[PDB]
């Protein structure tokens, strides 16, 4: 607005090149300026080359328009007319010069018939405009030329007319578009200045070098003369018209969302976009939503407006999900983006299956592999930055109200990249790079996911297929116990015998188990495998029977191959099914955001790195019984793995879950319990006290963490034999931790007798892994004294 | 159906760009919409480009159909007439431009002969639309365009006709197709606006890159301007139109399996397909078949209708093996896929030996090599 | 390119005018990153290979898309670590690889570095200086580069007291980053830092940093780091701690001298090039980098101050950049470390005058007199553990030569 205003003043104070350019609706600005001028100058009807015949001279177009203006100003109320037609006829008969594909000699005499000498339509034009001014009573005239985005080759002819006819004093020219394109135009057009034979002859690198250098020299040489910089128009953007983060807001606009808003209910523009993004993405009003909405404002006015005019209208239609309606708009808004991205186009093939491989694919064009699961528009690619937004919207849409679907997403989309970059990037060249990623995808069936246990058991083999540095079968979140119990080894350490476990614990560690079929057929135990089983079983249904079926399938020893580059349960069933009847009803409010699940995976994966580094050098012959922090066993390692899992869960959920408007984690150095649970216990205490003070429950806030601690398959691992720190300072904290667990769950997980036995037939707890021998662990030396 | 109804309401509450798009049969839905339209807007007979001659303008096509409509509405029961002939005559005269491979200068006097100046065929078209609305007592005119699946290049002709001529407040258009093709078309001629020599010379990866980014940016901006997201119809698929696993069934269809089928024996659609797959697969009623048929229903409606209408048809004939008739259907349904696969084409070399190598090849293209013999509908390739 | 260079210089100035944090961020990201690519990253680089290498480099540090100076500090620490040879001394260009595993039977009272033994404004500064690389063995390095990145981060966030604490956590907290794929108890420190902010935000308005001055600062300071590293790989003797004579060095001396080279280059280039002043108070002298001593830097300080007083110039009007850098609370602790202060009679007298000059420039006494005498013979604002912090790689077999 101030833009075109200053524009008008600039034109008016110019008469006292004459080319002005608006960088880029561009047509909206130009035409608004058009009416603004309606210092006496006559405006000319806007000229769009793309609205003009493929073979026309802008000269003829302008001539016809000038005809209408001069004639009607003259049909109003004579000498001017006939002389004008004299100029007109001179134009016309000299006009062929523009069109003719040849030179015919007969026109030499025509040129021999009568202020410089010849038949120059340029001058013809300048006296034409002279007479036109004489009639119209304006000091000059403006010619206008529309954006050539639809067909940018047209503007070239306008360009020649520029050099050839508009080199006149009473003329002002206005052009619109993106000068980069014009640069593209001229760079090519010069190339036709070359002799082809030249081009196929001197095709050596140095020669191409000077040839280009001259070409760009000429390109700039032109663009200066065509578009003097003083006359170029900036065209502030919406972000340049709207508060960046509130320290701005130069003349806010306001746009409508529902029908009425009688000029007072207009809900900002920044505010409305923030609403759309946050509640259509489960984003909360944290510091990301603003940056995303700014990276939504940066896109052209048309795209942003249409995507912000479709969402709310269809909201109105539906109301007579926000995350799904939001992805609906982005779907069309970035379809060409996505389409060129090669992403799922089949709206009938969206699912949660295609989603995870969509995240993976995006994380291959964006490179990253470090936080690409964050899906934030960090890429330079202006097509990838918005594909990120659309994919985040779709992930939220898929995960709305689904605990096990959230589990599936976090596993497949998040951990797949985490495992690749740290574990599959040592193999991959570029074509070999995409091949390697292809067979990686094939091994995992990513996007084509079979089951969470499937993905976990593939990930177990992947994890096993690398680590060195003492070859300890104690990885990020797994513990490689010995299956062939034949190794001359001390104390009560032994192999893992599942038969020694009972009830809800035997099946628990059997499901956390991973028996890969590399060749050794090593039996791995991984928090990854147990999490996959939990995700598999957490949204099956409320049925009692199929729950048992999935129970067996997950607990049934399933055997998988390495990637080619290396009666007794009716109680646990009832407990698990009660946990499911809780989960399937309290999960309907889960609204995890892609950023939320990105943070959860990042934190837990790195806590797994910590627990994998800190626990390998703690395996001693007496490390069993895990009384101290210097005694380690497979049981304590896996207990700390699950502890890292749940601690990251709670921390990231309190921080970033969209259901939460404020933080109860507290402003502190969030650190992880690696060899002690002090961090987790203290954070739980603070969160619980905050919930009590603000009159909230762990179901209202932290429902996912609540259900995760409420999983019957996880409880045996929390306080396993050999993994509870028996130091007095450790004992009081672990006791408080158990009390907090019982309070939050609403139930006492472990009996007082069980707790005292542990702290000095035990179902609901692991009793075999403490004495289970981990392959590779020497168990030579003992724990140091003092 | 309800899709057609909703879109009809959307179009009607639109007159108070102007293009509604149909993603994808599609022809059936469009014709249903047409009939539903028969708030006064005048409709015209469909516009099927792929079955319209190579060189003529969609402009002339529409002009002729308008001629017919107005002539009928005028021959029924003149002063409208001569003025309409006037408009039509100017249309014809300033119409050479489109065909013209070159500008003769002689049209310079044509463009000078007496609201932006010239002989803008778009303004002639808009005034023609004005005349049609006034004569027909209609608020606007609906234009239609059939899919260009058989010929997707001419459709850009419709695109250009829209960009030049249907940017009018008295016209609304209905396009239909799969936007992938529209994307190629935009791109398809985006790169031609380049110079051949330039593409010849700057074949360095970097320059290829910026050219591609510019082209696809421009394409995205054009597609959005042409087809606003809201104005396009999402359209339900058959699978979304039937119960996913029994937990659905929005607006069931029901199909007829044998000749009698007096509207009460119509053998489901989901249930009929499940029967067919199980029986032609020696498959039983497990959950495996359910997934096979879910990934069988998503297939194009014509494909599924032919495959399941040649199955029960031949079954009725045989009743005066089930699977043999069944894969008889598969030969015709997916033969293009199989022939693309390079696997057995001849029917008489079926045997037992050929089948082994058939699966052997199929596993070589789905990779797998672990359960590919499962033949599960697990490939990303729809072939 | 002759015009691209001028355009880039114009952009850098236009950006960094009046902005100390923006000066630091640019100075580091645009200049030191290029230098690092040169000296350390050029060792792998065909032209397509070189472009792939540069793309991977830029992707790693997010150059052009930088999140934070601390983030680039964490990335560049690992980048630096991914190479060094020649006795594998855990003291890099401007940083030192701390031993995080204290199971190494080594002499005297040398031990690990415990952040728990440190308190308040020194504990936090040292913890932020800590570089916890996610390489593999999880080697927690410490760089003056890491620290200066932290200062750049925390220097122009805002005047809010609380956000000071938030950024304080985010920076001083353990920072984890993998190697590039080619290899309460702070309530007083927060108050001091925010007072430093309340001074900087208001005295930084006149800084006019030029690209020339920015590049020259890096050029002098990086080579000063080179020399401060070369001179001190063979002075880590079993008795080298306590830094009494000029022939004993330790990790604390390393950190002090890296910061000192930083600020020395700062002062030299500010007196030499800053458009704010029309003349150079550095003087027509043999400008040398203080490497094993502070004598050169202190002579420069005394001369510059005397001429400022002669000309009626304040250190805020002149050397405002250097003034605010020296005023930094986090840089204060490394100024006079335990075992990094040369106690020689002549060394002691120059060190004392250097302390007094810094104190007068700042306008406040950093260290108590008891602190001063203890250093010359619960001490907050002072590093006390790095003196006995064993450097990974230093054999600590020999001691100081006699005579």
Residue numbers in the entry:
A (entry chain S): 35 to 50, 69 to 76, 81 to 94, 102 to 140, 147 to 183, 190 to 395, 412 to 519, 524 to 661, ...
B (entry chain M): 35 to 50, 69 to 76, 81 to 94, 102 to 140, 147 to 183, 190 to 395, 412 to 474
C (entry chain R): 475 to 519, 524 to 661, 704 to 897, 909 to 934
Give sentences copied directly from the paper behind this entry.
The RADAR system comprises two genes, rdrA that encodes a protein with an ATPase domain, and rdrB, encoding a predicted adenosine deaminase domain protein. Here, we determine cryo-EM structures of the RADAR defense complex, revealing RdrA as a heptameric, two-layered AAA+ ATPase and RdrB as a dodecameric, hollow complex with twelve surface-exposed deaminase active sites.
Further analysis with cryo-EM confirmed specific RdrA-RdrB co-complex formation and allowed us to determine a 6.7 Å structure of a representative single-petal complex. In the RdrA-RdrB complex, RdrA is positioned such that the central heptameric channel funnels directly into the catalytic core of RdrB. In agreement with negative-stain EM analysis of multi-petal complexes, the RdrA heptamer footprint sits primarily over a single RdrB protomer and leaves room for a total of 12 docked RdrA complexes on the RdrB core dodecameric shell. Nearly all contacts between RdrA and RdrB are mediated by residues that reside in an RdrA α-helical insertion that forms a crown on top of the AAA+ ATPase domain. We introduced several mutations predicted to disrupt the formation of the RdrA-RdrB complex, including charge-swap mutations of conserved residues in the RdrA crown (K150E, E151K, and R162E) and observed that mutations to residues involved in RdrA-RdrB complex formation significantly decrease or ablate RADAR defense. Modeling of a complete ∼10 MDa flower-like RdrA-RdrB complex demonstrates that the RdrB adenosine deaminase active site remains solvent-accessible, suggesting that supramolecular assembly could represent that active state of the RADAR defense complex. Instead, we observed that the addition of RdrA to RdrB leads to enhanced conversion of ATP to ITP supporting that activation of RdrA in vivo likely leads to induction of RdrB activity.
